[PDB]
Design a protein around this ligand. Structure first.
Ligand SMILES: C[As](C)(=O)[O-]
Ligand SMILES: C[As](C)(=O)[O-]
Ligand SMILES: [Cl-]
Ligand SMILES: [Cl-]
Lengths: 142, 132
């Protein structure tokens, strides 16, 4: 099964409202990869600010949802406070909108027990099509 | 020139809780912009990041620098890409985040560099923000 619900995600991650952006893990293979989703609703606090005349999920929150999914995989592969240390090669392909399901996959590149550093790639999809690519997210365990 | 929040809001469409530039200190069109974001415990995202340790999310530091870059673009006349982001040290309640963005290219695509400081010391670097 490998899927994880929100209550169990909360036991893994320190993040809470209004900055928890993984609704469900649908698949995970420890030390390899993880797939989850974020459901995108008009009823989310950020939408009033981004933007009044046109609701578009901020691209940086799409990085954040990929980062959080990625951090689930790291914690379940091996301090639950991981900070963003670097990110490279983010390309946003298409706007994410209220009504969408943001499906996300993060793949582990490296994880150093010793140093508390992890690197992963990430891709986000809507309706089977890429809306975001991230070449490399780096996390340090503060 | 310098720009206060009401004038910032006349340039940017961003509103609460996603307007992350509190002041523009200096702006030279087609060149550079310096501004700041004040970091308070009384911001909505801190309850979530994290309950037991309040740390300004790195991704919101990208966004603040991207919004600052957006102003310089609009006044030299979405977020398509970002690359070479490095966070050096956590930004905490009670800090002032001072930011500078430099225009690298305007070709229909604009590319800018970004730097964030807390007390003179770099807290974030962005080699490239890409807009169109
Ligand atoms: C997903 As994070 C680097 O804001 O804990
Ligand atoms: C970086 As933006 C498109 O939220 O101004
Ligand atoms: Cl955006
Ligand atoms: Cl962070």
């Amino acid at each position: 099964d490998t899927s994880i619900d929100i209550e169990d995600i909360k036991k893994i991650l320190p993040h809470r409202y209004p900055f928890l952006l993984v609704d469900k893990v649908i698949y995970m293979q420890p030390n390899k990869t993880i797939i989850g989703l974020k459901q995108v609703s008009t009823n989310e606090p950020f939408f009033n600010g981004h933007f009044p005349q046109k609701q578009i999920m901020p691209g940086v929150l799409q990085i954040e949802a990929l980062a959080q999914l990625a951090g689930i995989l790291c914690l379940k592969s091996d301090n639950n406070l991981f900070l963003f240390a670097g990110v490279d090669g983010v390309r946003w392909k298409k706007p994410v909108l209220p009504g969408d399901t943001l499906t996300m996959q993060a793949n582990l590149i490296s994880f150093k027990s010793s140093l508390g550093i992890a690197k992963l790639s990430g891709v986000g999809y809507v309706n089977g099509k890429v809306v975001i690519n991230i070449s490399e997210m780096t996390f340090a365990l503060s």
